[PDB]
RNA sequence: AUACAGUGAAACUGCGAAGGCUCAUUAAAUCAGUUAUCGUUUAUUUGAUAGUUCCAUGGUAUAACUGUGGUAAUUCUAGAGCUAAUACAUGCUAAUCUCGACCCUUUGGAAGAGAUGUAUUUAUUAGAUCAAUGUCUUCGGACUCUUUGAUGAAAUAACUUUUCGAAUCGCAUGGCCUUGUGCUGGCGAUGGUUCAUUCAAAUUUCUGCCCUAUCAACUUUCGAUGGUAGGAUAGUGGCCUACCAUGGUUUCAACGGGUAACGGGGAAUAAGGGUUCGAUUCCGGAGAGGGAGCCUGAGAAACG
């Protein structure tokens, strides 16, 4: 039960650190296209 | 005024009910001597 | 309701001999729920998968919008005096879209006294309702489809636009 | 009960395989059972093509997608692991699905006609194609009917081909379905028979629609390889 | 108006005009041989059927090619066999005499109407027929 | 529960001020500690106790935002707020650097400052608490180090607190106690000022009036220090002039000129800054520019200079006299500036300005002749006022001619600087001639004649109001000048102004012909006026699309003749933009509302295309782009493009007739177009009646002859079943007539 | 220009552009006409195909009855019997169309029982 | 194998049946293709796609099951007693994002200020400029009218009885010493909100072989024709209702007349000689004793 409480929280913070960083990581590529346009 | 007040004769209601002979338990003379005034 | 199809009626050419078909499911006309004033009861009907539709009948808490600042605040309902999409609809005092209904404007008094200080630049024939309490306001939202009563206040041009009518 | 595009011999059966839903439409695709079983003949019947689909040899568009009626439409690169089979399938000149064999550096990508560019939600530019690859953030100069080049490892657009007068176009649709040569004429009407017109051996002329045509490269240099005879 | 994809006009027909007299003349003036069988191998049911006609051995060659090509026996599909095998063998014993079908000589079908007298190269100009010769 | 508490806040006003102050007092009594923290500072604080304090500041913000007029404010709530703010500052600046609870207590402190500013945002001129100096000294001892902390584009905690304290009546007691404007002016005179600098400047400009209406001498010296800050911040409103909010600068500079005259160098700096207020940005409006020039005049009425600011004010009047905006209000302010500039030139300027601006009288024409007979030696503002009167200000026409002639007389009596003044006269007459004026264009022509003082007769006959024999003599003068970049550009501009879309007059073809003849005579000057010819062709090409394209098509076709003569002379250039303009002409060819103009545009592109090898590669495609609109079933457009194609055949040589015929036959190819498009080459072979006795391959044209007279066309024309095709007079007994003097 | 109740107004004076080679007149960009179903300001969006012809009757308001004769290559009795078509169309603030007046229309969003076309051009 | 452990009648469960006969005669309105839906629904297919926290685990109430029974009797029953959940329904949850006064020069950011969603239904508006190869060169610049390009003609004030911020699993003991499961820590399937595609449906543009004027008028007699608003809708729509206008189709064939409409229209396969026999989808719509009303579902006026 508590090991599932470890794994749930770890997968949640890893999901955040993947998705919410990758979104801005291609928004900066939009910024590069807008600067070059 | 198209559908407004069609003065036609309609099929299922032409014999939907049936009248009554005596009707009012009063007389018509009782009507006249009821609301003379 | 009944239907939504051209098969029961004539086109722009004047045709006859209709006798067409047993009416399908997708010609579904539901009953006209004339929304009134009461205690808030919304029927949750189903259509097209999980497309719940809110059919409001006795809604009260209208979110009506102060126009010049756009302040949608909560109030009650009194009655519609003029709506000639049916001139008996105002005789029976229902509540549909684009109706001009009366509101006790006490929270609008509260907002004016709260973000201006003093009590009473705004027009005089709505300042009379600022004093008295009942202001005219027209419903925007659809209680027969979205189940809500939202609206916009009458302020000046739209006020006289309806007051010259009735 | 069959279409014309599949190159399906009549002495086959009675029920024809309806493709399932997927990227492309029903009318512009061939499923994997009519691909593998009775066109290039890696199977003999539905049981063993389901057997090799359970074995998962197919790698169409870089993903496995184990299904019998998976609608492989235009230029989905069918990849088979054994004997490194890389197949780009395009249209021939008489309406069928000519499946050309290509190599690995060509099957590492595909191209796709852009259908619409949207300001959908939250300030995100947006692009779709015939397999529906909703990929993020192209340049603002993506018109309709231009050609993106998909990455096929990730999904990103790598190269871009602009639709204008003087581009090498492929026609998939109507009575011009599957022709190449792209230059006699340009004529954009205002709602129909609007196109760039395609030559022949004697440089004849042809009429089609905008949505029924899409660009593949330049006048002599397409980075797609094409079959020959 | 607008185009509409017509497989019936970009489909290989080649059979409305395939006449056996023209094809026989082409086989005569062909100047390349014809792949005839070793002579006993083409009679069918110990002579209870015919020999077999040229169209029947062409169709048999096609069926065995498709047969070996995708590893499948053809079948005894009832409606198609009750049409085609019985009607085919009865007109075979009607019209095929000694490996040669004489059914055509008993059949009204104009040669020059459909299969000769070119329609595309009709040459409806004196100048077009002059340029078609020279 | 956040939505539930938001509902409780939206319904938390229904009770009176007594119950609202009672609920606020209960909220204050959570962790006040007035026995411990109403003296100086707190006794102790915890993380969860500061979380009760951060929640108390959030509840104060929510209560003030709900009741954002009265808020039920009380001194117990004020003491609890001051205790919470001091505990937040103490915990944040006394805790070690671990930053988790420190950033929690810092976002507690910024939110508590936001809730404190909300109390003055709601109840400003209602309480005005007389024990303000307790909280004022507490917040000063907390935020002493916030000197340049509020200098940003978004730093608005203590900057908004300073603006609130400065925008009051008697709550500036804590301002004028020790210092508010000192730290505000430090962060204002910080050099990295973002656009909150204008907000701080407007706050100090509004707050100088409370410090001036205050009877306290300390606030009087603080108003003197606010004027000293207005004098020591002479770069901020200069460098931060990126928007149209220059009315704050014009409202401070008028206030400063009405308030304090403290140095002659300060008045010179103010006058030079208000001179840059009209010589920095062209987007300054009428009232702002008028008040800025009036503030420069108000500083000059006190402490102006005698040479430097004299010339600066003379340049200001020389710009404002060419302006004269806003129905003579700027002219009256310019006359006041010229009367305050205090020089001999300014004295003559005020004299000759007041003698003409006397409220719509004949004194203007009196004063023009007055200064003509008594010509002043200043002449700069005189030429400005006499060139505004020579522009489209209807009166003083002969007076404008006399003013231009007198300026020319002074420029000849100089015999250098007055020749550079004549350069400014010509650079004014150029923009006068390229305009929609009527009287001022004739005045600029009179100035051109006075600068010309054969050519003088030509100028006076161009300005002769006759326009038929006058335009004929103008064409003959152009012919004599053919047998000048800006000069011929000005002459062609005057000619194009006299024939500028005036389609209620005849001989517009000869007028455009005279324009193109002067353009050709300028384009012959290749060493100088090739750029001017390119610019004139570019302006005519812009006019070919700018809403009218009838005579501009013939202007394009006849400005192609400079390209034809240049290519015949070359027998290096820029082919790239010429080919792109050829593509633009081909796009205008596919327009048809512009079919005849597009056919002439195709003729223009073919006349221009005479390069080395590109005239081989593109002429067949140009003939294809020409004939693709005439093989298009039109009863008149085919004939008009046949006229354009006959002109194209007459233009091109015998080496191009093969490409022309091959492109025509490759564009028109279908049966029953083969019987109609023989009129093409029927016209074309007679268009090329002036070629020698060598010719093309002619297999093409004998093919045309054979298909149109032999076989199916013979059957078609010798049957009796065809409606009407007026381009069939059998049309084919002409190509041998074309070819007998060329081929056989 | 207000003969009916219920706040006759544009629905968010207002102005837009369908594009695609059809002008918007200056009163239809900035004028007092409401443009409820005229596609230049409107609520409708343009799509489909564009048809052209002269008119027969413009009797009722917001009804433009176009005629449309067109060529068709008849192979039956080998002569062209002449075509005629009809389509009702809503008004525009650009031309009071009288008899004659070849005009064109674009397909959009069925307005009455039989109108999908609204005028975009007069010439 | 003393809290589970294999066979497994009868019960809950996941799904199955995933498309079958007869009867009265519809003339591009039944049908086929096609245009469109920024005019709309969508289970499944496919590509994408979540930031509000004041003084170690939450509650009885029902089965199956036992037990007492009724009735001629059912997949008819009723009392009494227990008992479980991915059934019902209340509720436990670290600190990271930009502008950067200051920079110590590269290991560069410490102070301050501004942050932070979705789902529903309401309004204002972000949605004319600057850069040169050149106007004059005075080998400096005010430069756009010319010569070419560019940002460019969802930000917020509220409701709603609001959904959520994983009680799913697999592969991999793996790294660290906060001195013990102290942090586990790497990846992938199933979730999960929303968009687009695909599938299908509904409308809708147009096109498509009988003779028909002894059918010349029809349409307002289920609104006829359109406009304005509301209702209902999946939405467009006189689809329905209030008010208003008297329209609209037609000799360039309206509207109406019938069958070898058990036949026809490509509806389709064509066959190497049968020339209207010769492959098929569909005759029209209904019906589950008879009309009526209701319900279910991505899809229905259900063969159940």
Short mmCIF file of N, CA, C and O (backbone and C1' of nucleotides) in Angstrom, two decimals, chain C residues 4 8-13 16-17 21 23-25 30 40 46-49 53 55 63 65 72 74 84-85 96-97 141-142 145 148 150, chain H residues 27 30 120-122 158-161 219-220 222-225 229-235 237 239-240 242 248 255-256 286 297-299 301:
data_model
loop_
_atom_site.label_atom_id
_atom_site.label_comp_id
_atom_site.label_asym_id
_atom_site.label_seq_id
_atom_site.Cartn_x
_atom_site.Cartn_y
_atom_site.Cartn_z
N UNK C 4 -39.53 17.63 -37.59
CA UNK C 4 -38.71 18.56 -38.37
C UNK C 4 -38.44 17.89 -39.72
O UNK C 4 -37.45 17.18 -39.89
N UNK C 8 -44.14 16.81 -44.63
CA UNK C 8 -45.53 17.02 -44.25
C UNK C 8 -46.13 18.26 -44.88
O UNK C 8 -47.35 18.46 -44.75
N UNK C 9 -45.34 19.08 -45.54
CA UNK C 9 -45.80 20.38 -46.01
C UNK C 9 -45.35 20.60 -47.45
O UNK C 9 -44.59 19.82 -48.01
N UNK C 10 -45.84 21.69 -48.03
CA UNK C 10 -45.61 22.00 -49.43
C UNK C 10 -44.36 22.85 -49.61
O UNK C 10 -43.99 23.65 -48.75
N UNK C 11 -43.72 22.68 -50.76
CA UNK C 11 -42.51 23.40 -51.10
C UNK C 11 -42.86 24.68 -51.85
O UNK C 11 -44.01 25.13 -51.85
N UNK C 12 -41.87 25.30 -52.49
CA UNK C 12 -42.05 26.51 -53.28
C UNK C 12 -42.66 26.26 -54.66
O UNK C 12 -42.65 27.17 -55.50
N UNK C 13 -43.17 25.05 -54.92
CA UNK C 13 -43.80 24.72 -56.18
C UNK C 13 -45.25 24.29 -56.05
O UNK C 13 -45.96 24.26 -57.06
N UNK C 16 -48.45 17.89 -53.99
CA UNK C 16 -49.53 17.18 -53.33
C UNK C 16 -49.10 15.73 -53.15
O UNK C 16 -47.91 15.41 -53.24
N UNK C 17 -50.09 14.85 -52.90
CA UNK C 17 -50.00 13.38 -52.73
C UNK C 17 -48.83 12.97 -51.83
O UNK C 17 -47.94 12.21 -52.22
N UNK C 21 -44.41 8.61 -44.98
CA UNK C 21 -43.60 7.69 -44.20
C UNK C 21 -43.98 7.75 -42.74
O UNK C 21 -44.52 8.75 -42.25
N UNK C 23 -42.72 8.44 -39.24
CA UNK C 23 -41.73 9.44 -38.88
C UNK C 23 -40.62 8.82 -38.04
O UNK C 23 -40.86 7.99 -37.16
N UNK C 24 -39.39 9.24 -38.31
CA UNK C 24 -38.23 8.59 -37.74
C UNK C 24 -37.92 9.15 -36.36
O UNK C 24 -38.61 10.02 -35.83
N UNK C 25 -36.85 8.61 -35.76
CA UNK C 25 -36.38 9.09 -34.47
C UNK C 25 -35.76 10.48 -34.58
O UNK C 25 -35.94 11.31 -33.69
N UNK C 30 -39.50 17.75 -29.12
CA UNK C 30 -39.93 17.61 -27.75
C UNK C 30 -40.99 18.67 -27.42
O UNK C 30 -41.25 19.58 -28.21
N UNK C 40 -36.24 26.31 -8.32
CA UNK C 40 -35.38 25.94 -9.43
C UNK C 40 -35.35 24.44 -9.71
O UNK C 40 -34.78 23.66 -8.94
N UNK C 46 -31.92 13.41 -22.14
CA UNK C 46 -30.83 12.82 -22.90
C UNK C 46 -31.07 13.03 -24.39
O UNK C 46 -32.21 12.99 -24.86
N UNK C 47 -29.97 13.24 -25.12
CA UNK C 47 -29.96 13.13 -26.57
C UNK C 47 -28.53 12.90 -27.06
O UNK C 47 -27.57 13.31 -26.40
N UNK C 48 -28.44 12.20 -28.20
CA UNK C 48 -27.24 12.01 -29.03
C UNK C 48 -26.02 11.56 -28.22
O UNK C 48 -25.03 12.26 -28.07
N UNK C 49 -26.15 10.35 -27.69
CA UNK C 49 -25.11 9.85 -26.82
C UNK C 49 -25.31 10.43 -25.44
O UNK C 49 -26.45 10.64 -25.02
N UNK C 53 -29.15 17.48 -21.83
CA UNK C 53 -29.71 18.79 -22.11
C UNK C 53 -30.50 19.23 -20.90
O UNK C 53 -31.33 18.47 -20.38
N UNK C 55 -33.28 21.24 -19.36
CA UNK C 55 -34.56 21.85 -19.69
C UNK C 55 -35.08 22.53 -18.43
O UNK C 55 -35.62 21.88 -17.54
N UNK C 63 -28.53 35.56 -13.84
CA UNK C 63 -27.26 36.28 -13.89
C UNK C 63 -27.41 37.36 -14.96
O UNK C 63 -27.27 37.10 -16.15
N UNK C 65 -26.42 41.15 -16.59
CA UNK C 65 -25.14 41.80 -16.82
C UNK C 65 -25.33 43.31 -16.86
O UNK C 65 -26.08 43.82 -17.70
N UNK C 72 -21.93 40.69 -14.59
CA UNK C 72 -23.03 39.74 -14.55
C UNK C 72 -23.25 39.30 -13.11
O UNK C 72 -22.47 38.50 -12.58
N UNK C 74 -26.18 38.38 -9.72
CA UNK C 74 -27.26 37.44 -9.46
C UNK C 74 -28.47 38.17 -8.91
O UNK C 74 -28.34 39.00 -8.00
N UNK C 84 -43.69 39.90 -28.37
CA UNK C 84 -44.58 39.46 -29.45
C UNK C 84 -43.98 38.43 -30.39
O UNK C 84 -44.11 38.54 -31.61
N UNK C 85 -43.30 37.44 -29.82
CA UNK C 85 -43.23 36.13 -30.44
C UNK C 85 -44.43 35.29 -30.04
O UNK C 85 -44.68 34.24 -30.65
N UNK C 96 -38.69 33.24 -21.46
CA UNK C 96 -37.94 32.69 -22.58
C UNK C 96 -36.81 33.65 -22.95
O UNK C 96 -36.66 34.72 -22.36
N UNK C 97 -36.02 33.24 -23.95
CA UNK C 97 -34.92 34.05 -24.44
C UNK C 97 -35.46 35.32 -25.10
O UNK C 97 -36.58 35.35 -25.61
N UNK C 141 -29.61 33.96 -22.27
CA UNK C 141 -29.42 32.52 -22.25
C UNK C 141 -30.72 31.77 -22.53
O UNK C 141 -31.82 32.32 -22.43
N UNK C 142 -30.57 30.49 -22.88
CA UNK C 142 -31.69 29.64 -23.26
C UNK C 142 -31.99 28.65 -22.15
O UNK C 142 -31.25 27.67 -21.98
N UNK C 145 -32.77 25.08 -23.53
CA UNK C 145 -31.69 24.25 -24.02
C UNK C 145 -30.52 24.17 -23.05
O UNK C 145 -30.10 23.07 -22.69
N UNK C 148 -30.25 27.75 -18.30
CA UNK C 148 -29.82 28.88 -17.50
C UNK C 148 -30.60 30.13 -17.86
O UNK C 148 -31.20 30.24 -18.93
N UNK C 150 -29.41 33.78 -18.04
CA UNK C 150 -28.50 34.91 -18.09
C UNK C 150 -29.17 36.03 -18.86
O UNK C 150 -30.15 35.81 -19.58
P A H 27 -45.68 8.41 -58.69
"O5'" A H 27 -44.21 8.36 -59.30
"C5'" A H 27 -43.20 9.27 -58.85
"C4'" A H 27 -42.05 9.37 -59.83
"C3'" A H 27 -42.10 10.56 -60.78
"O3'" A H 27 -40.75 10.89 -61.13
"C1'" A H 27 -42.07 8.60 -62.03
P U H 30 -37.45 10.40 -51.37
"O5'" U H 30 -37.47 9.01 -52.13
"C5'" U H 30 -38.50 8.06 -51.87
"C4'" U H 30 -38.10 6.69 -52.33
"C3'" U H 30 -36.62 6.48 -52.60
"O3'" U H 30 -35.84 6.28 -51.44
"C1'" U H 30 -37.88 5.58 -54.38
P U H 120 -17.41 24.30 -21.98
"O5'" U H 120 -18.90 24.61 -21.51
"C5'" U H 120 -19.91 23.61 -21.57
"C4'" U H 120 -21.02 23.91 -20.61
"C3'" U H 120 -21.66 25.28 -20.76
"O3'" U H 120 -22.70 25.28 -21.73
"C1'" U H 120 -21.13 24.89 -18.49
P U H 121 -22.49 25.99 -23.15
"O5'" U H 121 -22.99 27.48 -22.91
"C5'" U H 121 -24.36 27.80 -23.04
"C4'" U H 121 -24.77 28.85 -22.05
"C3'" U H 121 -24.29 30.26 -22.34
"O3'" U H 121 -25.08 30.95 -23.29
"C1'" U H 121 -23.87 29.74 -20.08
P U H 122 -24.46 32.21 -24.07
"O5'" U H 122 -25.01 33.47 -23.26
"C5'" U H 122 -24.46 34.76 -23.47
"C4'" U H 122 -24.47 35.58 -22.21
"C3'" U H 122 -23.87 36.98 -22.30
"O3'" U H 122 -24.69 37.95 -22.93
"C1'" U H 122 -23.02 35.91 -20.39
P A H 158 -15.60 38.32 -10.72
"O5'" A H 158 -17.18 38.17 -10.75
"C5'" A H 158 -17.78 36.90 -10.59
"C4'" A H 158 -19.12 36.84 -11.26
"C3'" A H 158 -19.80 35.49 -11.23
"O3'" A H 158 -20.49 35.26 -10.01
"C1'" A H 158 -19.86 36.33 -13.43
P C H 159 -20.11 33.99 -9.11
"O5'" C H 159 -20.92 32.81 -9.79
"C5'" C H 159 -22.24 32.52 -9.36
"C4'" C H 159 -23.19 32.34 -10.51
"C3'" C H 159 -23.71 30.94 -10.73
"O3'" C H 159 -24.78 30.62 -9.85
"C1'" C H 159 -23.10 31.91 -12.81
P U H 160 -24.81 29.19 -9.14
"O5'" U H 160 -24.67 28.17 -10.35
"C5'" U H 160 -25.78 27.82 -11.17
"C4'" U H 160 -25.44 26.72 -12.14
"C3'" U H 160 -25.22 25.35 -11.51
"O3'" U H 160 -25.63 24.34 -12.43
"C1'" U H 160 -23.27 26.01 -12.64
P U H 161 -27.04 23.59 -12.26
"O5'" U H 161 -27.02 23.05 -10.76
"C5'" U H 161 -26.18 21.96 -10.38
"C4'" U H 161 -25.27 22.35 -9.25
"C3'" U H 161 -24.62 21.19 -8.50
"O3'" U H 161 -23.39 21.64 -7.94
"C1'" U H 161 -26.06 22.36 -7.04
P U H 219 -54.04 24.03 -55.72
"O5'" U H 219 -52.90 24.84 -54.95
"C5'" U H 219 -51.70 24.21 -54.53
"C4'" U H 219 -50.67 25.23 -54.15
"C3'" U H 219 -51.08 26.19 -53.06
"O3'" U H 219 -50.99 25.64 -51.76
"C1'" U H 219 -50.16 27.42 -54.84
P U H 220 -52.35 25.38 -50.95
"O5'" U H 220 -52.23 26.33 -49.69
"C5'" U H 220 -53.37 26.96 -49.13
"C4'" U H 220 -53.06 28.38 -48.74
"C3'" U H 220 -54.24 29.25 -48.38
"O3'" U H 220 -54.69 29.03 -47.06
"C1'" U H 220 -52.73 30.44 -49.78
P C H 222 -55.47 21.35 -45.85
"O5'" C H 222 -55.01 20.90 -44.39
"C5'" C H 222 -53.74 20.28 -44.17
"C4'" C H 222 -52.94 21.02 -43.13
"C3'" C H 222 -51.85 21.93 -43.68
"O3'" C H 222 -51.73 23.08 -42.85
"C1'" C H 222 -50.89 20.29 -42.27
P G H 223 -52.39 24.47 -43.32
"O5'" G H 223 -51.24 25.17 -44.17
"C5'" G H 223 -50.60 26.35 -43.70
"C4'" G H 223 -49.36 26.64 -44.50
"C3'" G H 223 -48.09 25.93 -44.02
"O3'" G H 223 -47.27 25.60 -45.14
"C1'" G H 223 -47.75 28.26 -44.01
P A H 224 -47.76 24.59 -46.30
"O5'" A H 224 -48.23 25.57 -47.45
"C5'" A H 224 -47.48 26.74 -47.71
"C4'" A H 224 -47.77 27.33 -49.06
"C3'" A H 224 -46.89 28.50 -49.43
"O3'" A H 224 -45.68 28.09 -50.03
"C1'" A H 224 -49.14 29.11 -49.74
P U H 225 -44.32 28.04 -49.18
"O5'" U H 225 -43.28 28.81 -50.10
"C5'" U H 225 -43.69 29.41 -51.32
"C4'" U H 225 -43.39 30.88 -51.35
"C3'" U H 225 -42.49 31.40 -50.25
"O3'" U H 225 -41.12 31.10 -50.44
"C1'" U H 225 -44.31 32.88 -50.52
P A H 229 -34.18 38.03 -35.86
"O5'" A H 229 -35.00 37.62 -34.56
"C5'" A H 229 -35.11 38.50 -33.46
"C4'" A H 229 -36.20 38.04 -32.52
"C3'" A H 229 -36.06 36.64 -31.97
"O3'" A H 229 -35.17 36.55 -30.87
"C1'" A H 229 -38.26 36.96 -32.73
P G H 230 -34.36 35.19 -30.60
"O5'" G H 230 -35.45 34.19 -30.01
"C5'" G H 230 -35.82 34.26 -28.64
"C4'" G H 230 -37.16 33.60 -28.38
"C3'" G H 230 -37.17 32.09 -28.33
"O3'" G H 230 -36.74 31.59 -27.08
"C1'" G H 230 -38.97 32.84 -29.66
P G H 231 -35.99 30.17 -26.98
"O5'" G H 231 -37.14 29.11 -27.28
"C5'" G H 231 -38.17 28.86 -26.33
"C4'" G H 231 -39.15 27.86 -26.88
"C3'" G H 231 -38.58 26.49 -27.19
"O3'" G H 231 -38.65 25.63 -26.07
"C1'" G H 231 -39.81 27.30 -29.05
P A H 232 -37.37 24.79 -25.63
"O5'" A H 232 -37.27 23.64 -26.72
"C5'" A H 232 -38.28 22.66 -26.82
"C4'" A H 232 -38.20 21.91 -28.12
"C3'" A H 232 -36.83 21.41 -28.52
"O3'" A H 232 -36.44 20.22 -27.86
"C1'" A H 232 -37.83 22.45 -30.37
P U H 233 -34.90 20.01 -27.47
"O5'" U H 233 -34.16 19.75 -28.86
"C5'" U H 233 -34.47 18.63 -29.68
"C4'" U H 233 -34.02 18.84 -31.10
"C3'" U H 233 -32.53 18.76 -31.35
"O3'" U H 233 -32.10 17.43 -31.49
"C1'" U H 233 -33.42 20.66 -32.46
P A H 234 -31.18 16.77 -30.36
"O5'" A H 234 -30.05 17.86 -30.09
"C5'" A H 234 -28.73 17.46 -29.77
"C4'" A H 234 -27.81 17.69 -30.94
"C3'" A H 234 -28.10 18.94 -31.76
"O3'" A H 234 -27.46 20.08 -31.21
"C1'" A H 234 -27.73 17.07 -33.19
P G H 235 -28.31 21.26 -30.55
"O5'" G H 235 -29.16 21.83 -31.76
"C5'" G H 235 -28.90 23.13 -32.26
"C4'" G H 235 -28.09 23.08 -33.53
"C3'" G H 235 -28.74 23.69 -34.75
"O3'" G H 235 -28.64 25.10 -34.76
"C1'" G H 235 -27.78 21.61 -35.32
P G H 237 -31.76 28.66 -38.51
"O5'" G H 237 -32.94 28.22 -39.47
"C5'" G H 237 -33.04 28.75 -40.78
"C4'" G H 237 -33.93 27.90 -41.65
"C3'" G H 237 -35.35 27.70 -41.15
"O3'" G H 237 -36.20 28.77 -41.51
"C1'" G H 237 -34.43 25.62 -41.78
P C H 239 -39.84 25.15 -43.41
"O5'" C H 239 -39.74 24.16 -42.17
"C5'" C H 239 -40.27 22.85 -42.26
"C4'" C H 239 -40.62 22.30 -40.89
"C3'" C H 239 -41.64 23.09 -40.10
"O3'" C H 239 -42.97 22.74 -40.46
"C1'" C H 239 -39.79 22.55 -38.72
P C H 240 -44.17 23.80 -40.32
"O5'" C H 240 -44.34 24.02 -38.75
"C5'" C H 240 -45.15 23.15 -37.97
"C4'" C H 240 -45.29 23.66 -36.55
"C3'" C H 240 -45.94 25.03 -36.40
"O3'" C H 240 -47.35 24.94 -36.33
"C1'" C H 240 -43.94 24.93 -35.12
P A H 242 -50.13 31.68 -34.83
"O5'" A H 242 -49.48 32.93 -34.07
"C5'" A H 242 -49.94 33.33 -32.79
"C4'" A H 242 -49.30 34.62 -32.34
"C3'" A H 242 -49.23 35.72 -33.40
"O3'" A H 242 -50.43 36.46 -33.50
"C1'" A H 242 -47.10 35.45 -32.45
P G H 248 -43.40 36.85 -56.55
"O5'" G H 248 -43.09 35.28 -56.53
"C5'" G H 248 -42.10 34.74 -55.68
"C4'" G H 248 -42.24 33.25 -55.58
"C3'" G H 248 -42.39 32.53 -56.91
"O3'" G H 248 -41.14 32.25 -57.52
"C1'" G H 248 -44.08 31.81 -55.42
P C H 255 -44.16 20.87 -60.31
"O5'" C H 255 -45.70 20.46 -60.25
"C5'" C H 255 -46.55 20.96 -59.24
"C4'" C H 255 -48.00 20.92 -59.65
"C3'" C H 255 -48.60 19.53 -59.81
"O3'" C H 255 -48.98 18.92 -58.59
"C1'" C H 255 -49.17 20.85 -61.68
P G H 256 -48.85 17.33 -58.42
"O5'" G H 256 -49.76 16.72 -59.58
"C5'" G H 256 -51.07 16.26 -59.31
"C4'" G H 256 -51.93 16.19 -60.55
"C3'" G H 256 -51.96 14.86 -61.28
"O3'" G H 256 -52.81 13.90 -60.68
"C1'" G H 256 -51.62 16.57 -62.85
P A H 286 -41.32 3.02 -43.32
"O5'" A H 286 -42.82 2.85 -42.80
"C5'" A H 286 -43.14 1.92 -41.78
"C4'" A H 286 -44.36 1.10 -42.13
"C3'" A H 286 -44.51 -0.20 -41.36
"O3'" A H 286 -45.15 0.03 -40.12
"C1'" A H 286 -44.88 -0.59 -43.67
P G H 297 -29.62 4.99 -22.24
"O5'" G H 297 -28.48 4.87 -23.35
"C5'" G H 297 -27.53 3.82 -23.30
"C4'" G H 297 -27.46 3.08 -24.60
"C3'" G H 297 -26.73 3.78 -25.74
"O3'" G H 297 -25.32 3.66 -25.66
"C1'" G H 297 -28.79 2.96 -26.53
P A H 298 -24.42 4.97 -25.46
"O5'" A H 298 -24.15 5.50 -26.93
"C5'" A H 298 -23.35 6.66 -27.12
"C4'" A H 298 -23.06 6.92 -28.58
"C3'" A H 298 -24.22 6.83 -29.54
"O3'" A H 298 -25.13 7.92 -29.50
"C1'" A H 298 -22.41 5.68 -30.46
P G H 299 -26.70 7.61 -29.60
"O5'" G H 299 -26.85 6.77 -30.94
"C5'" G H 299 -26.94 7.43 -32.19
"C4'" G H 299 -27.12 6.46 -33.32
"C3'" G H 299 -28.50 5.85 -33.46
"O3'" G H 299 -29.45 6.69 -34.08
"C1'" G H 299 -26.90 4.15 -33.62
P A H 301 -35.98 4.79 -36.27
"O5'" A H 301 -37.39 5.34 -35.80
"C5'" A H 301 -38.45 4.44 -35.51
"C4'" A H 301 -38.68 4.32 -34.03
"C3'" A H 301 -40.03 3.74 -33.62
"O3'" A H 301 -39.88 2.96 -32.44
"C1'" A H 301 -39.81 5.93 -32.74
#
